[PDB]
Amino acid sequence: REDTPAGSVIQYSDYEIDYSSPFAGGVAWIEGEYLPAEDAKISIFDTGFGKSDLTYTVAHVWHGNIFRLGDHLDRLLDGARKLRLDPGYTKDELADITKKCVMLSQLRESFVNLTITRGYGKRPGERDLSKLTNQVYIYAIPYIWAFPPEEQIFGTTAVVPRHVRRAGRNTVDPTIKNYQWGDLTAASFEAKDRGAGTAILMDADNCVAEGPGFNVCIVKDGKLASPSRNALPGITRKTVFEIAGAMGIEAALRDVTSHELYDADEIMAVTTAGGVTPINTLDGVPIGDGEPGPVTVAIRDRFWALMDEPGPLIEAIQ
Amino acid sequence: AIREDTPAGSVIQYSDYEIDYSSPFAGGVAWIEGEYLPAEDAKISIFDTGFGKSDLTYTVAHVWHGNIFRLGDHLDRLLDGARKLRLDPGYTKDELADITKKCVMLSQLRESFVNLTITRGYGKRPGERDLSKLTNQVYIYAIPYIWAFPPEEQIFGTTAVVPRHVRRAGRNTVDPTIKNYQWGDLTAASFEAKDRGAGTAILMDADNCVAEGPGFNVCIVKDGKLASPSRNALPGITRKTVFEIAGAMGIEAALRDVTSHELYDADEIMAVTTAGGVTPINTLDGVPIGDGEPGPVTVAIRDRFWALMDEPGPLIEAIQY
Amino acid sequence: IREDTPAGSVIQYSDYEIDYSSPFAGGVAWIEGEYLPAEDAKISIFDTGFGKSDLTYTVAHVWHGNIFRLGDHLDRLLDGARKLRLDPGYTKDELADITKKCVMLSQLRESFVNLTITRGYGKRPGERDLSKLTNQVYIYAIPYIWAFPPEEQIFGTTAVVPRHVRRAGRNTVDPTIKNYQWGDLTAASFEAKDRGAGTAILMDADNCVAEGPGFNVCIVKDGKLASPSRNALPGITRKTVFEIAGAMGIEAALRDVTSHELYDADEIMAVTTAGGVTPINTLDGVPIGDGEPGPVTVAIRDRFWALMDEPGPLIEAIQY
Amino acid sequence: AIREDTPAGSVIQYSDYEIDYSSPFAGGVAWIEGEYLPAEDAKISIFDTGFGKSDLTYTVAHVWHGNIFRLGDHLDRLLDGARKLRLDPGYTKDELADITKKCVMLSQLRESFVNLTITRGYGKRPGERDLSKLTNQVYIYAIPYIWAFPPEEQIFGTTAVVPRHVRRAGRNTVDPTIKNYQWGDLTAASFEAKDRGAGTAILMDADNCVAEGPGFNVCIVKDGKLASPSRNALPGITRKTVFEIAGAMGIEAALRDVTSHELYDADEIMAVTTAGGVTPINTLDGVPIGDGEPGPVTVAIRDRFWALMDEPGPLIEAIQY
């Protein structure tokens, strides 16, 4: 755990881990073996390294509840299929290994990763895709924040990069979650150099794409919009649209132009790693009053209440 | 296997020799977290952000008849990319040279694919957020020779398509001017080439200018002058060598935009990379270039390239086995 | 003027005689508030609609003496004018009245009708200050222009995806506002003609379908229709096609259509004011379906032509 | 109408002369369908596909102190672009030169903006579709001098922004390497620069490389070397002149990609164009370039460029009035 704002909707669990188990605090599952995370190593010759030839997903565990594991496995497996990767495990088999990683970890708040790689052959530097055995790697480790708890509650700041744009769907395709962060990293660097929390990247046509590890939603005239084309089909975004529909807020996946981002009444980053993050400022200009907007507060607070409501989560049997 | 067939009497012949397999380094070495290891033992932390974020750069050098080719030039390119990415190898050029050559020496390979990678690395604990807290890692390996195109295709040529569905990432995205493992577009291009029954793909950039192929630079010949893309392409050391050879032969060679029209109107196309050298491209979208057979400039430059690997000079250093 | 159309096809010109005693007979232009015979129609070389192509326009057709969806065209024309910061200085109902008088005076029952709004010119040639330019409205009704010959409307045309050209994106020369800036379209048409094809289907920056030289592209896949949403003119023919599809129980979506989905389509059609709905039989020489007009394309095209003879809100008969 | 204020003692000064208005050509001449007309009277067919399709190319030459600048180069670039578009002017270079110089003479203007346009034209029928059936048209005019930037800004400099919402059309769309009237992107950029209270816009291409501005090339100076975009930009005659001027001063000048990083980090930025020459850019996105005053290479190149309008030589030719 770490500090969250007092009385805010984000609070870690009160519990102590039994460290007599060497799995305590973090677990990896690799080449069919459960390992302490600090022991988790892969072949340097996995073409998931050499070619970043792989897809992944991340799911969070909050108050011992893993959130939308099924929706996560469905997007993982659909992406795997598109890349011609084969986990060699069923959805239900991967669910049980994931859940057992969390259980061994004893973590009630956990960042959880499933990665499917093209893998390695019998020989180092085997090139025939046909001779490479695809690898599944899973791990469960302490909760990770794209933005700190206090920014979740009080908001962060963004810039649109001067020097970077998002890779297009016809290049390094962002519609399949991948580890190819060349643009996303350069954009994070540009945001830190300019003293800003994060970056919102544009596509080739000056429509919003996404940010380094999150989707973007804007609110204008009480209506929500998130980019349809050059962005990951996020599960936090999916959750946010379900929330909005329940609240009677119109929510469209469509092209959001550069004009629309700069003219927004609210902007938010949505992601598995910390949920809903208000963006108070864009290029050093406040959005609305420069404090988290009211649709972003309502959806963020609703998001975190979901994590204690039996329904679309499952308690880890710790 | 330390060897495979090459066309009999061609300019491509592996070395005749025997590896002493009592040594456990025999046939492949990796240098990981300061330790020499048999290639097959070689593992990195899954929490290296060179995996999780492909936050790294690298170079590939080849060894042919016991000679490492242009190691100086590959360490210059590697460390300049590393500096642009704000990576620090924590080793000097001269130190990385010695560690590379000891990998080859220990492997006993006379023909070798050599990789130097520099990753952003990991922190004290897994998924460290703060970049300032990640320790950059360098990995080096020397394994048996890898061919971007088979020996047979080096001599008889390959075929190529321009993808219907794919383009090269631009320098303002995942920047191709810094060697990287971010191959999403290159893997896609390769699949589309394979589905279309072709040897390979030649990717266009956003402006319908030639970029490069999956693991190689493209050079064209038109009316006896040679050209290769300047923008959305790795500054290849093979391409640098090709330009030097053209220059010596009195052939004009230019780094400039090659338009889609220029690719399609070319008298010769060739692929050039460390991993196999100079590959003639006979056809493009099922239309013969020249006569459908390797071009005269391609052949002369390729044969000179392979002659370079046996000539005492500044481009090669003999591994002291 | 009229043209051979296939015998018994849904496309037939009117049978009628023009009175060539009137100098307006066969083609009218409305320029600087004066009605002229098409052939006398001239604009200042110094109109920045020329030297900058700083303008928007629309095209409506007249078929069997009925002008089709003039209100929709005026709405799109004026919506674009406002986004280019142009002022026609005439209301919708005024332009509607001028347009209908152009056709009446032409006596054409089958007509290509242009409305252009340019930034215009100042008191001097070469005026710099955009604010000192008087915006111009130009309107003509001339004989019917075919984006594809009547024969091709009935029996289909052939398409290529250009090797050398892409559609200008919405952040450059914006295709979502009808314009005369055809550099890409003209390039794409030359490449199609050089490759012996009927026309070109252009991609955008991301390998999504944009549109063709003067038309929207619709695909059919597994009985469902789709048409690009981003780098494409919001076509009024496309709009009719969607309305028809809806009434037929055919699902129809404005969305991204990938290069994949174009090459894998069960049907491809072009849709434009200048000739309606054209089957695309072949793409880069490969048959689409059986290489003859697809079933959904035929049903929708034949419906589209029937709309031009049915009393109702989409047509208005010209009072000759 | 024929002169406006220039800064006193500046290198930019209009000529002292009186025009005889007993000529109907005095102060503006157009040549349209083989007839000389007063500018005021110059009209084209609304059915010219140079209008309805902007299917055309053109060039602009300036006259200064009764001298027309590089008319030969302008005719070469015009005719090259017309052949690329499969336009045929129906006149030779020397015939176009004779008519151009005769427009300037009938104008009586010593300072003049001179436009040659070649259009695809019209057929016998309004709205002919077959390009084979269209008669290519030539339109030439000579009107009073036109300033992309006012004289004051030529001497004391202007301010630029990079657009937030607009990019230059690439060479594979509406090609900027062939001078054209298709200003959709450039007009939107000017409107964004005006809304942002800035002198002008410098547009980027798809790869975040500098393209050009609305009606001008961009040059940057860095560590005393000059660079100007090679790809998505008109090969400008002013830029050509600046590069010749740069070389005669011992300043290195490259046509190459200028990244977004190079533009923002420039020691000097200048706009170069036929309509007013070399304009210093003092500020980019409100950030001063150098000391926020015209740069030393900018000033030296500009002052030399205006001296070229008086020196007898191959760059200028006296109009016989």
Residue numbers in the entry:
A (entry chain C): 19 to 336
B (entry chain A), D (entry chain B): 17 to 337
C (entry chain D): 18 to 337
Give the text the authors published on this PDB structure.
A mutant M9 with significantly enhanced activity and thermostability has been successfully obtained and crystallized for structural resolution. Based on the level of thermostability improvement, the additional five mutation sites (S105P, S121M, H152N, A168E and R215G) were sequentially incorporated into M4, resulting in the generation of mutant M9. The half-life (t1/2) of M9 at 50°C represented a 208-fold improvement compared to WT. In all three structures, the asymmetric unit comprised two polypeptide chains forming a homodimer. For insatance, the Lys195, located on Loop2 (Chain A) and Loop4 (Chain B), served as the catalytic residue, and the flexible loops of Loop1 and Loop3 were likely involved in substrate binding. The results suggested that the mutations in residues surrounding the substrate binding pocket (L162I, H69K, K145R and K142P) had minimal impact on thermostability, while the mutations in residues positioned on the surface (S105P, S121M, H152N, A168E, and R215G) notably enhanced thermostability. Through further rational design using the crystal structure of M9, the mutant M9-1 with an additional 1.9-fold improvement in specific activity was obtained.
In this study, we focus on the ω-transaminase from Mycobacterium vanbaalenii (MvTA) which exhibits activity toward d-fructose rather than fructose 6-phosphate. The transaminase MvTA demonstrates transaminate activity toward d-fructose 1, and the resulting 2-amino-2-deoxy-mannitol (ADM) 2 undergoes dehydrogenation under the enzyme GutB1 and spontaneously cyclizes to produce the valuable azasugar mannojirimycin (MJ), which serves as a precursor for 1-DNJ. The dimeric enzyme exhibited the characteristic structural architecture of class IV PLP-dependent enzymes, consisting of two subunits.
